[PDB]
Design a protein around this ligand. Sequence first.
Ligand SMILES: *[C@@H]1O[C@H](CO[C@@H]2O[C@@H](C)[C@@H](O)[C@@H](O)[C@@H]2O)[C@@H](O[C@@H]2O[C@H](CO)[C@@H](O)[C@H](O)[C@H]2NC(C)=O)[C@H](O)[C@H]1NC(C)=O
Ligand SMILES: *[C@@H]1O[C@H](CO)[C@@H](O)[C@H](O)[C@H]1NC(C)=O
Length: 381
Amino acid sequence: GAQDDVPPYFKTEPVRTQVRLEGSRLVLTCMAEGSWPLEFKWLHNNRELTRFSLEYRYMITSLDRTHAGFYRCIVRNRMGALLQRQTEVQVAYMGSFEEGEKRQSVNHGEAAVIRAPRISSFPRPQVTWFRDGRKIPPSSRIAITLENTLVILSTVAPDAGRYYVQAVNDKNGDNKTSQPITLAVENVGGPADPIAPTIIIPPKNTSVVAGTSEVTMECVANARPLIKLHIVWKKDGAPLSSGISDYNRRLTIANPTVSDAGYYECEAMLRSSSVAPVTRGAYLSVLEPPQFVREPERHITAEMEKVVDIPCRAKGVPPPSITWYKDAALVEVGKLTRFKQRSDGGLQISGLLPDDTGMLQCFAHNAAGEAQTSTYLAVTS
Ligand SMILES: *[C@@H]1O[C@H](CO[C@@H]2O[C@@H](C)[C@@H](O)[C@@H](O)[C@@H]2O)[C@@H](O[C@@H]2O[C@H](CO)[C@@H](O)[C@H](O)[C@H]2NC(C)=O)[C@H](O)[C@H]1NC(C)=O
Ligand SMILES: *[C@@H]1O[C@H](CO)[C@@H](O)[C@H](O)[C@H]1NC(C)=O
């Protein structure tokens, strides 16, 4: 036949996540190819936003937090339709510190744990601790946790005054200062007797998606005298001699994969001492986004009234769920329908009608991501 019948496809897929500034102009794109004319239609959180249009771009003139969320387009032409992989638009912003001043106490020789003041913001801001206008960096006796929690180890009388933070939003440059947390050190000035080692900030069960550059476990401990305090990290019972930083309070695993998943434990102990060591540990879980193992031929031809199977096999951690679309419409695979979904993921269509012709598209989804693959089904006479 004289006319072109190249079905729609995506030249490129959109980013999974993108942070954009409040009030900026946002231009989402459907980078689709296929025989002309191609029409485009947009979804926001799976609710229709626009009607089919020749325009492949969706433009938001000024972006606010209401317009955040998931976007995906549907593209069609004479052949059929495809559903795009969605992108999450995240609107950067920052408010102001609203909690107000706080008062906190700690006993001599114990550690003061001061959570950082909460501020509404995206992304999470860069937090710096201050006291008396001077920055408070990590040291032998001062820890700062992955959550910007200040931990003052083996507190003494001078460790008392007003502590506050500075928050900087690296996307919009905003710079705000919190209300102080006032710290009191009590029962000051006894004999500086030794205090047995305790773990104040224990390892957290941690998840990370493969492809992430780094994952960190954290363990903050207290003892008196601090100079004798020693932190040892263990994987599978054997001490780790690499990847440790930040006064032994951190363990870094570079480019983690499932091989690095398992139980990591932290042991706090005192050198030249008879005191018992204390151990706390957690599980590192590594997720893998869906990857196709088998994708269908881009074209499948089957005879009318016959049966056809369309393969779709994907791997992932956790094992991904599989969803079928016919021209961007969810396929209903309930009984009393000609459509059955295989255990290996494949879609089986029986009693083929000529209307079954068109794009069949398969999504593999899990918490770590989504992948899509498709084929043109032609039902011949
Ligand atoms: C941290 O999580 C574990 C369980 O996590 C799962 O099991 C691991 C073996 C590993 O497969 C991880 O990737 C999993 O996500 C919690 O362990 C449970 O602890 C309770 C008692 O507290 C016990 O009765 C259950 O049997 C445990 N469950 C399992 C599956 O082992 C552990 O408590 C978590 N630690 C936290 C939240 O601090
Ligand atoms: C935030 O503002 C204060 C006051 O102008 C300034 O001293 C500080 O350096 C700023 N922080 C950053 C990260 O720019």
